[PDB]
Design a protein around this nucleic acid. Sequence first.
RNA 1: GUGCGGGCCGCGGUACCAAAUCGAGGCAAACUCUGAAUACUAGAUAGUCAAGGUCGGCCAGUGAGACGAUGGGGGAUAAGCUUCAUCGUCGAGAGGGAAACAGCCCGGAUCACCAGCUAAGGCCCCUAAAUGACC
RNA 2: CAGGUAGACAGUUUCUAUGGGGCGUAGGCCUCCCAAAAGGUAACGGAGGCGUGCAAAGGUUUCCUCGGGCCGGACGGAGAUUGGCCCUCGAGUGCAAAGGCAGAAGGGAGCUUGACUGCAAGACCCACCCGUCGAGCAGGGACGAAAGUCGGCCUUAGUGAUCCGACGGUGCCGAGUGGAAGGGCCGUCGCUCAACGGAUAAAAGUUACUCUAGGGAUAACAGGCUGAUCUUCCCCAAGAGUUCACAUCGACGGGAAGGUUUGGCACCUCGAUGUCGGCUCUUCGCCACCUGGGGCUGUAGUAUGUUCCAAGGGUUGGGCUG
RNA 3: UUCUGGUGUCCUAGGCGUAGAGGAACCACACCAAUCCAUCCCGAACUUGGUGGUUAAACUCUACUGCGGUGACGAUACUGUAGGGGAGGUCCUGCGGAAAAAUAGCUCGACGCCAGG
Lengths: 86, 122, 65, 135
Amino acid sequence: AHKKGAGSTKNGRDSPGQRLGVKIYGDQVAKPGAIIVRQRGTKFHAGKNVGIGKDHTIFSLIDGLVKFEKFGPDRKKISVYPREIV
Amino acid sequence: KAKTRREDRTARHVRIRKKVEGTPERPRLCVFRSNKHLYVQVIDDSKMHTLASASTMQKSISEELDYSSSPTIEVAKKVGEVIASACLEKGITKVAFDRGGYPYHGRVKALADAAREKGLQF
Amino acid sequence: MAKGKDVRVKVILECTGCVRKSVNKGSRGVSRYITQKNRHNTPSRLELRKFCPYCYKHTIHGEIK
Amino acid sequence: MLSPKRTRFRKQHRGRMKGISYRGNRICFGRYALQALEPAWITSRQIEAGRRAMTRNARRGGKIWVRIFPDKPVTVRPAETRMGSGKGSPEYWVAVVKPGRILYEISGVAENIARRAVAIAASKMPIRTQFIISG
RNA sequence: GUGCGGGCCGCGGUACCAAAUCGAGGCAAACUCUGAAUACUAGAUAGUCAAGGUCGGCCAGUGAGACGAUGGGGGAUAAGCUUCAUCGUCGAGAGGGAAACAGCCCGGAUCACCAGCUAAGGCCCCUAAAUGACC
RNA sequence: CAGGUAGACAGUUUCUAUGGGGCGUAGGCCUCCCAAAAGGUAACGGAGGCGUGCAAAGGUUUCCUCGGGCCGGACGGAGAUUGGCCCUCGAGUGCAAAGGCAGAAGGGAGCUUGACUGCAAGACCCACCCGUCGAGCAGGGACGAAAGUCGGCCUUAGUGAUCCGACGGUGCCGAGUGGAAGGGCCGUCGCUCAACGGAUAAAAGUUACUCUAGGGAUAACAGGCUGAUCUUCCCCAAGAGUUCACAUCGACGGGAAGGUUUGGCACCUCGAUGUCGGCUCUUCGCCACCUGGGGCUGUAGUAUGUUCCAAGGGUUGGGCUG
RNA sequence: UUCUGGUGUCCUAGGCGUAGAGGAACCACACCAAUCCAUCCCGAACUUGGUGGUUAAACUCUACUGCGGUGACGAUACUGUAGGGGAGGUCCUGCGGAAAAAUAGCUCGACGCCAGG
């Protein structure tokens, strides 16, 4: 059953909290960064909720997936070198 | 004494919305009314520029009574139609519904409806 | 029922559509496909919510009067 | 490097005296001063035995100022093995006295009387002390 | 320093006994408005390395490792002590050097050879090599 | 046949983690730090929580947005209703905690109730199982004028597979045929199975009678490393010593030596090195108590106190108790 | 070119405080309000129909360097790599990188589309 008495906390943790891909790259419709789950949808990389200045990627791939609080949410579309023929 | 930050009016009337941001900028429709007249504008997006901008006064030039009332709802639809038509001729209907401060039946109810008379349909 | 370490039970009921079936189970101690959980003690009784079952779409739902 | 504190939920890790980086104060209050050379765990029984001694050879004179304050607790093991962390209050508590920082301060008196005063105060300190003046 | 109140006679007043606030001087893994090296991810290029990098298939072995340097928890920042991360060595490679010390340093052994030049460490004798020059 | 009694007898269980074992405590998930600025990464290392709550604190549309304090007012004498000013994550978020948030999930109201079915490009997280996010598509709805949102609740825990089974649907099958029972498939329920990746439907102790398989990687005597404590010495120094700090001693504190105390380590020995004490017989070193040579002495002498060199030598017989 | 309104690229060299100043051509107050609509109390705020007056406030400019903020050179801290010392448990040297605070100084923004004088 539930134990009680003189003792401190226990059990370690791991989200984890890293960053997938990065600026200037063929960021596919995966999930860049995603430090925390439940990240809303975003048709691009990110660039908000931080120091002045927005981020941008050289190539995109139909929507994406980035955090909701940090880096994001969704605003303007960015994609250097138009993905078109001729 | 101590600097205080207060969110401006145009920052609490729920002006900017999500979804529509699917594009760098959504084709909003500047339908604001002053303290005497009303100014309409089909501002484009991307960076700037617009398709067609009309006003209550400008209409007086085409065909309207001189000392005629402007705040009247009758003029609303007139200001929404004058800005239209030519706006479509510029290329293709690229106007949406954007207005934060008019309780639906505001002085813009005719402005948005006027757009549904030239081609813009949703 | 009185909450505590003794004799508890998850107040989970069902919501069968009016004169219909599917998207719901009917037995002694079974729950619907959506598995609804009422409060029992808290003023409830008579549950219902228009849901979309198998046959056609959207009905009434809400069994146990 | 300690002074009268107040009750609180004080009970954290030990810590670790790092480079001289942090400490690097100067001489603000009082004419002369006294600095250290190497960090350490100064207990309360050291600062008190050094402060009273600073005025012990004076008695009714100027005023003593303390530009320091302890923080890093001190946990000690009784005599048994090692089952858990120490208490934190068996003997006392300390902090970190890195070089470059100022300790005692004396003023309102002559140069000689303020010179010997720091002498005895330096003896109470476990770590070597450097005597300065101003400028 | 200013200052609601509250202690001692009790309204003039009084040692900061003592909250906020202004100026000056500090501490913190869970403080940090700011802010390196470095690590890592990704896009090109010149070479170099006798595909090392990746996938699938057959047979393995091994899960109580130790030590030194460096960055941190435990202990008094006491232990070749213990528990993690990283690099190297031992452990599955001698030898040269530290007198003798596997883990420290140099260098990392296909073999022969009364063949030379070096690294680390040294050059009075004992085991080869400066009681060499100048201050 | 069957209900009690029934270890007198028989077959077994009675966990582990744990810097000996044992006792205690600790043996999932969720928040921060130690993890040394991409993740990941230990230890009964440092501070707190969960085994839910909720016809709605769900979704949507519109609108509204603090705390606290100062100056005023009938019921105020520190805070309660009102008005004005300063109104600045220092508020409010269902509950711990980090982060984030006032384009608000904050707060209120109406309509409602996607707290939707069937799928789902492309990826994250794990050895695996498993977990998490997700534009768009198909069949139907809710809110708003519309664009448009919603596949639960700000996010992260609020949990647990397998097998045995109850029950509905589904003419899938159903061993001669036609049915049925049963099974399969769709959907749901039962297990503080927590020692919770859970060995049973169901199982506590002793063994100084002990036995066997192994090892000091797991203890006891002891050597060794280390050594806070202990022992010895020393620094500054208010005082005691009438006066006078140090003849003697010496508070508040500090720096070392040595190493026989109390511990840790438990590095080499459980294919073993017999524990203490006494007796017999000694060896060496030193901060040697006595004998000898000296300084100071609040040392007159006779006798002592302290300190330095020095041990050459010598250094007790009994009552009681192992 | 000057002035004014709506919406952006840039978000405290662009903020706040103080002083002055301008427009019924534009924007705000303001007038009226049996209504569509709103106020769980008042049309204060939204909203609707519109003489007069004003532009005080608000807002938009200008001036004024109190309070914020932006930010060198040099030095210092720290650190990768390759080594050397070392009793405080860190530190030094060759080499590369080299901020925070602080100082001089900068500074009280600068522009883009459209419309109305």
